[PDB]
Design a protein around this nucleic acid. Structure first.
Lengths: 124, 419, 532, 110
DNA sequence: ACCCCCCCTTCGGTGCTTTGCACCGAAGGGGGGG
């Protein structure tokens, strides 16, 4: 099996609504030491914005854009990751990727095997 | 608890090594630790009547910004008795080996009274505002070669219940660290190390319990090893389809030097192409007899030299060379031209800015490898001026041990270990 | 005379007391020797009540009493002195009120170990020492650690007052007004008196304070007046004392040069040496710098340390350590020649290290450096050198003469350049040899050499090729010794032969050096091998 | 949060033809050591990790791509621009959380 | 007579560039402190 990340759960949401995105991981276990997942969004035509990162030891790191609204989780049983997005506004309309974050050495840590990306649109 | 009698090797006195200057961070951090250790009886104040001294400095705690206390007991270990009254060959085969700092156990066993005077160290003062504040150890000090041996009878008792329930887990100890090898993965190795951390805690052995840092440098990765994936860097010849007479001269010189390690290397057919006196930039085609010789030389250099075995009665020597662009090559050997391992490092801390930060990382990497493979620390031949190294190396050190080293200045006549 | 607990001291295992013979003294010597030995017996410092003996002498100040304990010191146990260095005024912070005190009869105010007083015997009439005698190697170390323990309860009860203890010398200062300061100073004078230390009001509450050979001012500091020898005919012992005071002056007076004066020391101690022109100029330049008064400021922990190095030529460097511009904390100089061959870049690295260590000692941190070397020049050096080398945070400053690399060996051979094949050889017993070259264009030449060695011939062969070639030339040799020198890119050397090669390489445009093993049949090297 | 690190790229877009040499800089608002990753995002596709730790090429990346650092001035260079190389390039720091991206540099054909 | 630091030169021990050559640490001259 090759490393694969497939996002799911996007769609149109109403103002003040919420939404949970899934990131199914195949080819590597989320229980592996040094492994994490990372959510990144990109508004149509705009650039990349980092959102959240959950690590193998339940450590979480959020961006200031999503503090108090977004919650990152991981179910090691289903080996998938989640991002519960509460209190959505039109500024949250973007394509949402999940990428594999891994501390591989004393000096190397990046984002690899980016998923295709699921779209989230908020009405206004 | 009683004290085990400790003596020095016959005919040698204690250490008398001068204290080097320390920054304000470390001086403020060493006085705060020494007061807490004096109130706890671990160290007691002394004076100039003690004629011995050993250097003390400070490093960083694991996964923390708090300062640690580290003593350079190198000269003392050379003078303490040989504690004798087995090394796991399979430790270097495990899929994962974790290092655990168990030096806290040493601060519980009292030290021989007639030996504490050999443990003296001196704290300096910024701008010599105050003379030297000296101390000596009352308990087993971390980084002393006698501490693990005196405590070996106690630790084997602590680990035996754990080793029974997990009979496939190698545990090797060197100085203040435990090397725990296992074949587990998918999070199973991580969970079993925390079981050992819980086992040691029930016997009163504190271990660093801080969450692994998520911001670089990821210094905690130096304690997570995978010896089954370690490779050797073999001697490699230049790969070209067209050769000038200068390329062949470089090739002949590299082969002539390589023949001192590999006896089967021949040069006759290649040097026969340099019979005339031609320009260095002239391309010459190779004869069918020269290409056969180059192929037979590449085939010899694929495998390391046979007939070289590790001799535990001899010491290990480590030579390091700087190849540039963050590349460092090294060879470990007991006798000349009989290397037990040839390796290479790259993409280290300070690869773009600091040669000293790279070299200290490589020295700790080579030492950790030699502890897993043979159970010894090698003597280093560092390619750096003496004053340059001693000025900066303490700022990048992280291990509780310090290996022996000397300094060399060997310019590269040929680039043997890296092409 | 002090209630402090005695310090247990022994002797080296397998040794006995001195038991030396006192050499005869003059009539005027025993005059004051009989008057002072009775004053100590009455003061409670000795007791004339032991088969040992040590020679005793006296030297006029008046007079002075000193006992020769060289045989007792050779038999006493070793010590670890607690005095790790010398304080420096550039490390002091600006204090509002300052006082400096000294303790009279310091060594005589500390009780000696009872079980050791036996060995302190001496005849005049035999006495025995009951305190720390002058001339005993353990006396200074034992006194200092005793003084430190006494000052600890004060410094713990007053954590806002600084005490710089050097032996029996004390520097005290705080940010309190002149009233509370003179009050708390008297509290100390009674604290040292309570432990048995007299402070003869050798007392200064009077600026400028003379401390450790300096002159402390409320906002500045300077060294005490320096008087250089102004001699008619210079002898080598006079030159030695000259450079010694110039070194002591270079800590605040910038731009001190010493190299040319020291080259006269290269030797009977009373031989009158004629000064060279350069040494007479260097001395004059130093006198000009010392004519004007120069001061230094004090340390401010809020501002960053800055160190600036300038090149002076002939392997000489000076530096200034400052926090605010044109207000030096201190100055210094580096002029050491480590190794037979070197360059300006290596020496600058060595100077950055000396300044780093010195800055850790005084202030406890590394300064930010301002160096006369371009970032690209440093990048080329450290990324290509075979040895690890590094410099802390530093920025380039354009104060010529800048530091540079005077030539560069090519990485690949030069197309269209006449290639040379040099080699050298000499005879061990004959001490005579030769060195020549053979080019690819047919050119050939061999020059005989006299009183050379094997290495000197291999270097000479390289010299010939550089002379008989154009701006671009390829050179092939067997001497790895000669490559280890040239590849280091040296610009200054001690051997005249290498300096001749250095100047030749700067004149060229492209030079390529390569090494081939000998006696392996390489054409050119095999041809020129039989020719030497 | 104002303590976040700012990654500024230059230029925001550039035009070059096949075979040209392209340089793309990205300056960090504070010292991030050498801990920078470069990413390539072709139109309509997901981002690809191009360079990690300032200068290390990711597996599968041709030899024309290079990464360098001068203090806080990071540089991505393309020695021989290829039709496959026309994409948008993002620098990303990871010296401190939260991680931050550059605004992006678009390499177009003209 | 004792104790500490600094610079400059000389000299001898020590391991390769090998029987010459380089590097380094101690000692002795000087400065400075008590």
């Amino acid at each position: 099996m090759e490393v694969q990340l497939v996002e799911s759960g996007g769609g149109l949401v109403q103002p003040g609504g919420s939404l949970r995105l899934s990131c199914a991981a195949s080819g590597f276990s989320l229980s592996t030491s040094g492994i994490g997942v990372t959510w990144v969004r990109q508004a149509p035509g705009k650039g990349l914005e980092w959102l959240a990162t959950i690590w193998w030891d339940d450590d979480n790191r959020y961006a200031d854009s999503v503090k108090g609204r977004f919650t990152i989780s991981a179910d090691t049983s289903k080996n998938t990751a989640y991002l519960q997005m509460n209190c959505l506004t039109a500024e949250d309309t973007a394509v949402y990727y999940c990428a594999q974050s891994a501390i591989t050495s004393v000096t190397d840590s990046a984002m690899d095997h980016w998923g295709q990306g699921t779209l989230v649109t908020v009405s206004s | 608890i009683e004290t085990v009698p400790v003596k020095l090797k016959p005919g040698m006195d204690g250490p008398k090594v001068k204290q080097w200057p320390l920054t304000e961070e470390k001086i403020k951090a060493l006085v705060e630790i020494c007061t807490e250790m004096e109130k706890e009886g671990k160290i007691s104040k002394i004076g100039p009547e003690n004629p011995y001294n050993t250097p003390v400095f400070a490093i960083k705690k694991k996964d923390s910004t708090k300062w640690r206390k580290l003593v350079d007991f190198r000269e003392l270990n050379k003078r303490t008795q040989d504690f004798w009254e087995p090394h796991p060959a399979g430790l270097k085969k495990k899929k994962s080996v974790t290092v655990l700092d168990v030096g806290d156990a040493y601060f519980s066993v009292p030290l021989d009274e007639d030996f504490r005077k050999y443990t003296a160290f001196t704290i300096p003062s910024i701008n010599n505002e105050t003379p030297g504040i000296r101390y000596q150890y009352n308990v087993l000090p971390q980084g002393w070669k006698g501490s693990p041996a005196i405590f070996q009878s106690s630790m084997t008792k602590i680990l035996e219940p754990f080793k029974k329930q997990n009979p496939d887990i190698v545990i090797y100890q060197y100085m203040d660290d435990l090397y725990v090898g296992s074949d587990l993965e998918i999070g199973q190795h991580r969970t079993k190390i925390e079981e050992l951390r819980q086992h040691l805690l029930r016997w009163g052995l504190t271990t660093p319990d801080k969450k692994h840092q998520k911001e670089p440098p990821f210094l905690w990765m130096g304690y997570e090893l995978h010896p089954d994936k370690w490779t050797v860097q073999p001697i490699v010849l230049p790969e070209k389809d067209s050769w000038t007479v200068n390329d062949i001269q470089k090739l002949v010189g590299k082969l002539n030097w390589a023949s001192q390690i590999y006896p089967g290397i021949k040069v006759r057919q290649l040097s026969k192409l340099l019979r005339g006196t031609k320009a260095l930039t002239e391309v010459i085609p190779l004869t069918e007899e020269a290409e056969l010789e180059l192929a037979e030389n590449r085939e010899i250099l694929k495998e390391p030299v046979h007939g070289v075995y590790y001799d535990p009665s001899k010491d290990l020597i480590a030579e390091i060379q700087k190849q540039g662009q963050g590349q460092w090559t090294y060879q470990i050997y007991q006798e000349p031209f009989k290397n037990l391992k040839t390796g290479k490092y790259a993409r280290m801390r300070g690869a773009h800015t600091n040669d000293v930060k790279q070299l200290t990382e490589a020295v700790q990497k080579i030492t950790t490898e030699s502890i897993v493979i043979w159970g010894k620390t090698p003597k280093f031949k560092l390619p750096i001026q003496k004053e340059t190294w001693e000025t900066w190396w303490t700022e990048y050190w992280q291990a509780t041990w310090i290996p022996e080293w000397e300094f060399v200045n060997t310019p590269p006549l040929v680039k043997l270990w890296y092409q | 005379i002090s209630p402090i607990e005695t310090v247990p001291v022994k002797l080296k295992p397998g040794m006995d007391g001195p038991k030396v013979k006192q050499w005869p003294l003059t009539e005027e010597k025993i005059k004051a020797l009989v008057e002072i030995c009775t004053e100590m017996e009455k003061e409670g410092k000795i007791s004339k009540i032991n088969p040992y003996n040590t020679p005793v002498f006296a030297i006029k100040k008046k007079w002075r009493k000193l006992v020769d304990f060289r045989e007792l010191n050779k038999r006493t146990q070793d010590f670890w002195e607690v005095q790790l260095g010398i304080p420096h005024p550039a490390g002091l912070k600006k204090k509002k009120s300052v006082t400096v005190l000294d303790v009279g009869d310091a060594y005589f105010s500390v009780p000696l170990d009872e079980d050791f007083r036996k060995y302190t015997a001496f005849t005049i009439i035999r006495y025995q020492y009951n305190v720390l005698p002058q001339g005993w190697k353990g006396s200074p170390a034992i006194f200092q650690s005793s003084m430190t323990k006494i000052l600890e309860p004060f410094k713990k009860q007053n954590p806002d007052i600084v005490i710089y203890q050097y032996m029996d010398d004390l520097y005290v200062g705080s940010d309190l007004e002149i009233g509370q300061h003179r009050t708390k100073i008297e509290e100390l004078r009674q604290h040292l008196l309570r432990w048995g230390l007299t402070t003869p009001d050798k007392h200064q509450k009077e600026p400028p304070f003379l401390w450790m050979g300096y002159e402390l001012h409320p906002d500045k500091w300077t060294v005490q007046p320096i008087v250089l020898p102004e001699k008619d005919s210079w002898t080598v012992n006079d030159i030695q004392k000259l450079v010694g005071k110039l070194n002591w002056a270079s800590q605040i007076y910038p731009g001190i040069k010493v190299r040319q004066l020291s080259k006269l020391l290269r030797k009977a101690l009373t031989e009158v040496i004629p000064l060279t022109e350069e040494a007479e100029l260097e001395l004059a330049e130093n006198r000009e710098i010392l004519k004007e008064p120069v001061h230094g400021v004090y340390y401010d922990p809020s501002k960053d340390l800055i160190a600036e190095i300038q090149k002076q030529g002939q392997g000489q460097w000076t530096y200034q350590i400052y926090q605010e511009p044109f207000k030096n904390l201190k100055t210094g100089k580096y002029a050491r020649m480590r190794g037979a061959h070197t360059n300006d870049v290596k020496q600058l690295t060595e100077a950055v290290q000396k300044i780093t260590t010195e800055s850790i000692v005084i202030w406890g941190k590394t300064p930010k450096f301002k160096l006369p070397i371009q970032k690209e020049t440093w990048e080329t050096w450290w990324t290509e050198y075979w040895q690890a080398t590094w410099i802390p945070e530093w920025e380039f400053v354009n104060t010529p003469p800048l530091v540079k690399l005077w030539y560069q060996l090519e990485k690949e051979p030069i197309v269209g350049a006449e290639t040379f094949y040099v080699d050298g050889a000499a005879n061990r017993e004959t001490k005579l040899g030769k060195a020549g070259y053979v080019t690819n264009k047919g050119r050939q030449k061999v020059v005989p050499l006299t009183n050379t060695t094997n290495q000197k011939t291999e270097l000479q062969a390289i010299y010939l090729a550089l002379q008989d070639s154009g701006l671009e030339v390829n050179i092939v040799t067997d001497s790895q010794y000669a490559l280890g020198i040239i590849q280091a890119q040296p610009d200054k050397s001690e051997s005249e032969l290498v300096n001749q090669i250095i100047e030749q390489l700067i004149k060229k445009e492209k030079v390529y050096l390569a090494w081939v093993p000998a006696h392996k049949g390489i054409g050119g090297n095999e041809q020129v091998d039989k020719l030497v | 949060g104002g303590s976040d690190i700012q990654m500024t790229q230059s230029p925001s877009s550039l035009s070059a033809s096949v075979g040209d040499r392209v340089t793309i800089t990205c300056r960090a608002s504070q010292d991030i050591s050498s801990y920078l990753n470069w990413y390539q995002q072709k139109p309509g596709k997901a981002p690809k990790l191009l360079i990690y730790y300032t200068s290390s090429l990711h597996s599968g990346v041709p030899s024309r791509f290079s990464g360098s650092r001068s203090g806080t001035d990071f540089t991505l260079t393309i020695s021989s621009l290829q039709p496959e190389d026309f994409a948008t390039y993002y620098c990303q720091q990871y010296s401190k959380f939260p991680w931050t991206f550059g605004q992006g540099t678009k390499v177009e054909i003209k």
